[PDB]
Enzyme design. Structure first.
Site, mmCIF file in Angstrom:
data_model
loop_
_atom_site.group_PDB
_atom_site.id
_atom_site.type_symbol
_atom_site.label_atom_id
_atom_site.label_comp_id
_atom_site.label_asym_id
_atom_site.label_seq_id
_atom_site.Cartn_x
_atom_site.Cartn_y
_atom_site.Cartn_z
ATOM 1 N N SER A 81 -57.499 23.693 -51.274
ATOM 2 C CA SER A 81 -57.392 22.306 -51.738
ATOM 3 C C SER A 81 -58.759 21.779 -52.229
ATOM 4 O O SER A 81 -59.015 20.582 -52.126
ATOM 5 C CB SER A 81 -56.741 21.350 -50.730
ATOM 6 O OG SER A 81 -56.026 20.363 -51.444
ATOM 7 N N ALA A 135 -52.896 15.219 -49.309
ATOM 8 C CA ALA A 135 -53.192 14.098 -48.455
ATOM 9 C C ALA A 135 -54.123 13.145 -49.212
ATOM 10 O O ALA A 135 -55.104 13.594 -49.842
ATOM 11 C CB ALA A 135 -53.888 14.541 -47.173
#
Ligand SMILES: [Cl-]
Ligand SMILES: [Cl-]
Ligand SMILES: [Cl-]
Ligand SMILES: [Cl-]
Ligand SMILES: [Cl-]
Ligand SMILES: [Mg+2]
Ligand SMILES: [Mg+2]
Ligand SMILES: [Mg+2]
Ligand SMILES: [Mg+2]
EC number: 3.5.2.6
Length: 263
Positions: free
Chosen positions: A105, A212
């Site tokens: 990520s 997120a």
């Protein structure tokens, strides 16, 4: 399955936030289950799969090379860049950046890949060209994670991105080599997989990307199934919760547990 819907609802109640959900049959694209499927949610880092799909499309077209080395500087480094912060002096190849962006990520990796394609507008143009009329990228990392109330930037719908993921992972949008590379990146082991990997039976396949952001934004897109082969796409998003991160994660994990139990 209706039991999954009940768990989606329970997540909304526990989190104090909307949850969007869709399951598709991977071969046919048929919608098997849905909740708020056409409502908008922030992409957060789930967009990194779409980004790497656009990169691979350019590779297929002879417009990019996976081995091209990208050189960058300290000021390019943004938060949550665990791989790119280890390559200021030596650079990273396009291939290495996509691996970092998806498996780790890595935020700066995604920003560099965005530069390679010419930016958020070029990602959005790619999406429009493949028939996704909803998904939009407007900003780079970390600002795309803002999750501001009433902001349409950097959003998708469950339904849109589920169909887009299906287009990228199946059929002929990408060459076989590029499809397989995208799947390989998404399947690679990661440091922590609370949202689904934690529910997934042994011997099942999963190719996933979580996200997120700020203001409660959390999501996952996945192709998964029994016997080492995917058979369904699942997309889960939420935004707005101010519950703890652990509670967010648990509630989404329980949705996944239900999907698996009632498969
Ligand atoms: Cl609904
Ligand atoms: Cl809807
Ligand atoms: Cl706000
Ligand atoms: Cl996860
Ligand atoms: Cl927290
Ligand atoms: Mg409560
Ligand atoms: Mg330099
Ligand atoms: Mg329209
Ligand atoms: Mg594994």
């Amino acid at each position: 399955h209706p039991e999954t819907l009940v768990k989606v609802k329970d997540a909304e109640d526990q989190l104090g936030a909307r949850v969007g959900y869709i399951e598709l049959d991977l071969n046919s694209g048929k919608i098997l289950e849905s909740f708020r499927p056409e409502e908008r949610f922030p992409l957060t880092s789930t967009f990194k799969v779409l980004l790497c799909g656009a990169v691979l499309s350019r590779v297929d077209a002879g417009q990019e090379q996976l081995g091209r080395r990208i050189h960058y500087s300290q000021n390019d480094l943004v938060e949550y860049s665990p791989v790119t912060e280890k390559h200021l002096t030596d650079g990273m190849t396009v291939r290495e950046l996509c691996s970092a962006a998806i498996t780790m990520s890595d935020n700066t990796a995604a920003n560099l890949l965005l530069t390679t394609i010419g930016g958020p507008k070029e990602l959005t143009d790619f999406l429009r060209q493949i028939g996704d009329k909803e998904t939009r990228l407007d900003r780079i990392e970390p600002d795309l994670n803002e999750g501001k109330l009433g902001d349409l930037r950097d959003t998708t719908t469950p339904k849109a991105i589920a169909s887009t993921l299906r287009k990228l992972l199946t059929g002929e949008l990408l060459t076989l080599a590029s499809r397989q590379q995208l799947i390989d990146w998404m399947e690679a082991d990661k440091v922590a997989g609370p949202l689904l990997r934690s529910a997934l039976p042994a011997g099942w396949f999963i190719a996933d990307k979580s996200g997120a952001g700020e203001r409660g934004s959390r999501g996952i897109i996945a192709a998964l199934g029994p016997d080492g082969k995917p058979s369904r796409i699942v997309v889960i998003y939420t935004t707005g919760s101010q519950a703890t991160m652990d509670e967010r994660n648990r509630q989404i994990a329980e949705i996944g547990a239900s999907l698996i139990k009632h498969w």
